[PDB]
Symmetry: C3
Subunit: 334 residues, 3 copies
């Protein structure tokens, strides 16, 4: 069909871990879904010690926001690189077909913009990331990555062909950073991106992240920013990692239905404790909460979780089920 | 149903790689299965060089013993921390729902005990591990982890709905250790756990294990302690890794049926050479032996296997099948 | 059936990434498929800087060539170790059953040869590699590994039982090297293999590759040696990694059907962006090209791809589809 004849709609994005409002069951036929993102280079404090890096972002956040469309919609993105930025950027969608995912068509210097369109032909969650030729891992590992969800037009299904309907959705972007260190082990600081580049390449080549965080910083998804749910609520957690493997795990829960490699035409894996999301992939886990209280949601390399930053919390409200779990004899001397 | 009315039974555990006797087909309805484990902090020699660490164990072994129940049984564990220990401990079951898997309800100082109950609602093999708030990876990577198998009530099945019945079962716990090193590369020794802690955190933060072993030490599953089987015997190998990915492989065999991420409501992967068990997961592989002789069972990062310790042996008895394999021309000059 | 009565055929191998001619649908019943490979120790330049290593090869290439048979054929390999070599070698097939995959039966000193036969009882792609007792990871990580494809007799199938027929096939072998470094970080050179050995073991024990390459060198599958396809062509890419995990990704495409762990009795995963091939495994991805131009095929640890070598190219010929992707507004000031 002629694209000028399709319905169109403009989306307004939200900051992770929240996700812009959408309908699971598509209420139109295929449409052109219009997004705008503004690139922002900015200083970010990433840990409790105060370590500050020069982050490269889509729309001011690490990760960039989650975009949501349906299968066979067209994604039309206006990408803006303001003149207050210093570097060249572009965008590669793993959801898209051709021209290096879009990166060959979207190179923008500071002071430029561009508009890309692609057809979202395959249902799933997918990574998107900046990828300028010759400096690709530097941009990705400076935070310049996010994800897009392409829902089936009829929503998610279980393997029996019955619907799986989530009540809430969160997007957890997991970021490996490589802050350059001196031989004593202290982080270096730099005067310009160009003076940092070789140091950044050397740090990356060690293959050892200095920090691994959710939503851009140690502790970002804790305290006043903990994730929330009620007992009985169905929650979808989309989780991306653009550069290294991760192994997500809900401490005190499970993934009832998990698309570990993120693609909805496949039946989900059931009853997972932990799953493997390869670097360069988005995955998705569906869980119905059964107990109240605090949960930690982690990368289950527990060093990566509890020493390097890859840990957030849920606070869950409701009644405690002693059939599922109880303390028979509380800790006591003996 | 009211829990005080269910059948009960007391289990007596065995040391890995052996597994306490149980029935594949459950002969009772749901029951309360009572276990006791005693925590033991102890010195362990982990390699041929004599490197000695302060291990943290459930029941005196690394890994802790395999517990076996059926789906919808209740697990009731009496956890004892004798006053001859120095640290605080607890337990998190990945099989359980609520209170951080049990860790929030089971904190025991030296001289204390506690009794936890949980309903085993999902069939599979699962990790269990100690997880005291603020020192989680230190306990796990000191050996304080094991696994629990929750069998379907009707036993294991293939994808056609026919039974898979094992003749023998082994439990391989794989442990990554992070022994602190000085700048020359030699292992440090410490006077108290507290004096070691910061050094342990620094070693963990490198993300590079110094040792990766089966059953607690280099060579533990070799020689007089090699695993055994006969030609034609059906063997289930349960394999856990509480903190890092592993890639198991039977040298000279296969995994005929593999639940790589361990959950029995999913159809197994067939005919595997090698499979990925994510850190924080237990998996299970079923194989029928077809040839006698020595096999090595390894993590197929062969450096991890043959230089760092992640290798054991099977000795298999029976007839050699020249149809499956033969030397046509033995090695000779030419 | 008596093996002396079966048909026989002699195969002549080709250099990767090409694959010897074969039929997807087997035109004979089970047969004895005769191969010969000659071991070659040789100097290889692996990067643009000129770093030269002493490689250990099957048939002169890294990886060794792809062998192709059908399920229940017999593989009969004549392995030759000429007297111009210095080391002892053997071969382990992950496709085979017994005697450590063949390694226990195929030990050849320089000046010796041997002939092994095994029945290829399981369909899939599988790793093969040298594995001399006591020096296994040194040989594998010096390049001494390849793969074998065991096709079902009726060819590949989708999950509905309909045929998947590829028009072309490529074999990408991915190699992690561990070139020894001094404390300043410069590569060491050695006078004999024996003088290098301890240094090689120390480098391996860091677990950190210095190089990760396709087809034996940085840039090997680029320029005049880029992979090629036409729009509409069905391509199978077999990808092996004998020692570390990889996460393959076609930049600008997908894996339409992927056997991530390589075994054809399992239904493929659909619509993958990226997939996890565990170390010690071969996998296979089937894709129909839909857009022309340059693609990069990478390990999606982008540091491993673009800094350490794990990147090749496709050049695809044909018409551009503006329905799938177009630049609406080309980059411009604003
Ligand atoms: O049980 N979560 O480490
Ligand atoms: O074939 N096992 O390295
Ligand atoms: O989108 N490939 O990095
Ligand atoms: Cu950028
Ligand atoms: Cu990418
Ligand atoms: Cu403990
Ligand atoms: Cu855990
Ligand atoms: Cu060799
Ligand atoms: Cu092997």
């Amino acid at each position: 069909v002629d694209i000028s004849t399709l319905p169109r709609v403009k989306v307004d994005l939200v900051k992770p871990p929240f996700v812009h409002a959408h309908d699971q069951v598509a209420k139109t036929g295929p449409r052109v879904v219009e997004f705008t993102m503004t690139i922002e280079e900015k200083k970010l404090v990433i840990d409790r010690e105060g370590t500050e890096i020069h982050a490269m972002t889509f729309n001011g956040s690490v990760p960039g926001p989650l975009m949501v469309v349906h299968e066979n919609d067209y994604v039309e993105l206006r990408l803006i690189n303001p003149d207050t930025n210093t570097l060249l950027h572009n965008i590669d969608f793993h959801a898209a077909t051709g021209a290096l995912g879009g990166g060959a068509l979207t190179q923008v210097n500071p002071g430029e913009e561009t508009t890309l369109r692609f057809k979202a032909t395959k249902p799933g969650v997918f990574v998107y990331h900046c990828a300028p030729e010759g400096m690709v891992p530097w941009h990705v590992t400076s935070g310049m990555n996010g994800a897009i969800m392409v829902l089936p037009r009829d929503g998610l299904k279980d393997e029996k062909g019955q619907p799986l309907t989530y009540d809430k959705i969160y997007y957890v972007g997991e970021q490996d950073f490589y802050v350059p260190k001196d031989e004593a082990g202290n982080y270096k600081k730099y005067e310009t991106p160009g003076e940092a580049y070789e140091d950044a390449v050397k740090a990356m080549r060690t293959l050892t992240p200095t920090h691994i965080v959710f939503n851009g910083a140690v502790g970002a998804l804790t305290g006043d920013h903990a994730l929330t749910a009620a007992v009985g609520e169905r929650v979808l957690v989309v989780h991306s990692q653009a550069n290294r493997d991760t192994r997500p795990h809900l401490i005190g829960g499970h993934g009832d239905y998990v698309w570990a490699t993120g693609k909805f035409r496949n039946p989900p894996d059931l009853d997972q404790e932990t799953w493997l999301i390869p670097g360069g992939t988005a995955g998705a886990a569906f869980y119905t909460f059964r107990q109240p209280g605090v949960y930690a949601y982690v990368n289950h390399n527990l060093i990566e979780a509890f020493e390097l930053g890859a840990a957030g919390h849920f606070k869950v409200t409701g009644e405690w089920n002693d059939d599922l779990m109880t303390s028979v004899v509380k800790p006591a001397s003996m």
